[PDB]
Amino acid sequence: ILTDENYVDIAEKAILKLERNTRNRKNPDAFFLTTSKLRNLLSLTSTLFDESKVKEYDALLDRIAYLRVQFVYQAGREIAVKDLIEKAQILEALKEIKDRETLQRFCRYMEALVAYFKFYG
């Protein structure tokens, strides 16, 4: 669950709750999650959100089905993105979309996650 007052705050205190790199004291207290392994997940929802304005929802409900495919697949490849979708509850934000304004809300949630990831190192 995420609603219109909290989906940026959820992203902020979900990036902050993530765990930092132990070693590598060159730029220390940095993240395991590289920027590419998160931009290649916002890449899906950005091209969704630019298509949600043009298209109706009930012609764009195969792309949202592919979202839960790709988030699960990127989670199972490295422990960092698995930790991401377990910290910032992205799978439990993907069972609950079901209409257009919630789809754009989830896309802006993903954008807030990337923005606060770029902000804190």
Partner: peptide
């Protein structure tokens, strides 16, 4: 909106 605080946090850091 509140989301523009995050957009500005991305913009200034970029």
């Amino acid at each position: 909106d509140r989301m523009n605080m995050a957009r500005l946090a991305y913009y200034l850091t970029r």
